[PDB]
Amino acid sequence: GCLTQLYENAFFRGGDVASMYTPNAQYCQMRCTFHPRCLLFSFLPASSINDMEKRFGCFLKDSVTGTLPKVHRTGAVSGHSLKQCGHQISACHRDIYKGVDMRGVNFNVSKVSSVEECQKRCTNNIRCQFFSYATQTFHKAEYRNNCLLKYSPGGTPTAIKVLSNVESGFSLKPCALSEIGCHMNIFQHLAFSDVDVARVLTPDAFVCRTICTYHPNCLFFTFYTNVWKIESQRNVCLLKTSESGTPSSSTPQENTISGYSLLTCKRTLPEPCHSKIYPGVDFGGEELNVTFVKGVNVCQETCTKMIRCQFFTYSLLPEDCKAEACKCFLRLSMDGSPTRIAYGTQGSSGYSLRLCNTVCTIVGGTQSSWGEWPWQVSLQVKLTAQRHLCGGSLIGHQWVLTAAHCFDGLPLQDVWRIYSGILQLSDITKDTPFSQIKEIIIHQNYKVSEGNHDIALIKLQAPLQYTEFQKPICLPSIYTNCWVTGWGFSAEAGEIQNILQKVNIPLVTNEECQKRYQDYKITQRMVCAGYKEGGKDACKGDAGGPLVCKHNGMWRLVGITSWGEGCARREQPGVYTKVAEYMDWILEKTQSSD
Ligand SMILES: [Cl-]
Ligand code: NA
Structure with a gap:
């Protein structure tokens, strides 16, 4: 399954499939994730090795067991690909x-x-x-x-x-931040020329386009369809570039389909997996395993769960079938594409979904930008007027985590509108889509007007689809890089902010927080954050939003914005619900409702 653990002072011996220079271990891990065979990586920071040629060395590795010997090497960092990690898979690297x-x-x-x-x-x-x-x-x-x-x-x-x-x-x-945008254009019966950077077989032009999108030196492509009478031309996907960056020529040609990389699209990129099943075709490659399964969708599932499987063929030949199960051939190649695409087959082929990326375990701030905090949502009430009241955090396709107190006046689910994938409240019009609430789950021990157990789960009526601008935050199972976000007041007697705000705030021990708030019991189920001098804090309209911390390169939801005495006062930290202490409640409530 998904393995985000890192190994400090460790270097894996052998299994090398590719090497390159990367600025840090997280970028090396991303290359491992997207590489067709990498399961494991090792990275050398410049301090860790004298040899000039090996400093910033990123070593991508495979193993038939998913494991390798490792040695102690001071400063080296090792880890796994993020294959099988769902929404944690992204090529976005902002550092x-x-x-x-x-x-x-x-x-x-x-x-x-x-x-x-x-x-x-x-x-x-x-x-x-x-x-x-x-x-x-x-x-x-x-x-x-x-x-x-x-x-x-x-x-x-x-x-x-x-x-x-x-x-x-x-x-x-x-x-998904480019302003140029992208050409979705598909040109029928048209070929490009230029410089070929790779050649692979694909079942259709759309798979070719996705491969081009994620190939670092592809800008455009030409696909040759299976209609070609010339056998060696069929199913060829040519990944291309040009010295200028745009095609220098075009040539009309029957049974050829051309298009562009989609890497410059705004908001959403194509998913880095090919999820369609292709009837009547066989995908050649090295055999990993063969087992009998009940139908082609289970064959796909079997390939996805076997992390080295890249693609499969499910046989419908009678000699390969029982009453309700047939042979599922799990396969792989050097580059993740079949070595042969054969039609007129009795069977159906497809790919692993291991890289498909669709729960996981402000005063004194500045303006956020697109995709920075893609889990942030706006909880709004429409009566006659509409207004933003609270934040929340997306934690799965149909689940938002927020503060229970947001619902004190209107626990009725019918008046609420939840906005996601939004940076500026001024962008919302009567036409902007919103999520509606199906269920509110307020913690059993929460009491209106009291601060204990200030935590609620919201089940949406419709799942949300993940994009670079709208995707969940992972939950926890010390922190030094914590951030709080929201559209709340920018002063204690302030106003709602149009552009989502962010601020960096240090955590404060419970001991210290309790000293600052002698009239309230600061419990182990609360976490506190603020500066001795004040001036940076959450405020009214931020409640229910996230306190997130980045640790070992990974964001996780550490708190839910709850309360403070006023906002940003000296020696008065913000108090947040400590999410780690409610994980049993979150998993039970989401599993029980689902
Ligand atoms: Cl597709
Ligand atoms: Na695709």
């Missing part, structure tokens, strides 16, 4: 690396005022995969304040150096 130079082809150089502006330029340039920003103090005077846009084979830097006054990062195309 900026200060004091790091990521080398490649420096195809475009311009002046900018910040590393964030350089990143936006990279995101909105079709050829840019990664960038470096040379600050005012960069040693080469002729690069000071310049943004260098870059590409490389495979989209990984050709070298990574520790270097002062350089700040590097990746394009945010895979965060």
Whole structure:
């Protein structure tokens, strides 16, 4: 299943399938996730190895048992792919690396005022995969304040150096943040030419397009259909690029279908899996396993659960079948595509769903941006007027976690509208879709006007589909990088904020919080956060929203915004419901309702 655990001071021996340079272990893990054979990775930070060639080395590995020998190596980081991890699978990597130079082809150089502006330029340039920003103090005077846009084979830097006054990062195309947008155009009976970066067999042009989208050096493609009379031409998916970034020519050709990478689409990218089953076709590859199963959908499930399976063929031949079960051939190849696509077969083929990514275990702030906090929701009541009252956190397709006190005046579910995948409240019109409540589950021990057990589950009438802008937060099973978000007041006697706000706040021990609030019992089921001087806090209209902390590269929901004495006062921390202490309640209530 999903294995997010990391191994400190550890390096796996052998099983090597690919290597590259990455700025950190999380980016290496992402490459492992998307690589067709990687199950395990090991990463060397520059401090961990003298050998210049091995610093920032990312080593992608496979094993027929899913396990490898490992050695102690100070500073090395090892882990698993995130295959089988559902919505945790994403190619979005927002991190900026200060004091790091990521080398490649420096195809475009311009002046900018910040590393964030350089990143936006990279995101909105079709050829840019990664960038470096040379600050005012960069040693080469002729690069000071310049943004260098870059590409490389495979989209990984050709070298990574520790270097002062350089700040590097990746394009945010895979965060669905491009402003250029994307061409959904499919051209029938039309071929492209240019530079072929890969050649694979696909059952249709749509699989070809998704493979192009996630291939670092694909910008557009041409598919040759199974109608070709020339056998060696059939089902060929050519992944392509051009020195310019756009096709330099087009050629009319029967039984050819062309299109573009969808990596520059806004809000939502195609899912990085091919979920259709194809009747009458056989997908050739190396045999992993054969078992009898009850129908082709179970065969798909079997392939998905066997993490090395890439694709399968379910046989409908009588010699391969019993009364209600037939042979399911689990297969793989070097690149995740079949080695042969044969039609006129008695059987049905498809792919593993292991990478399909569709529960998991403000005062003094600044404006958020798209996809930063994709679990944040707005809880609103419509009577005659409509107004935002509370936040919430998406924790599954049909579940939001919030504060019980949001419902004190209106526990009736019928007047509530829940907005998700929204940054600015001004964007909501009478046309904007919203979720409706099917069930409110207020904690059994919560009492109106009292602070204990301030936690409620909301079951939506319809599931939400995940996008880069709308997806869940993982729940916990110490923290130093915690953030609170919402549209609440920006002053104690303040107003609702149009743009979702964020603020970074340190956690405070219960001991300390209890000293600040001598009139209330601060329990082990509460968590507190704030500054001695105040000035940064949640406020009215933020309640029920998230307190999230990023630990070992992973966001998790640590608190639910609950109360404070006023907002952002000196020596008066915010108090949050401590989600870890309600995990038994969350799992029981969601399993019992479901
Ligand atoms: Cl598809
Ligand atoms: Na697809």
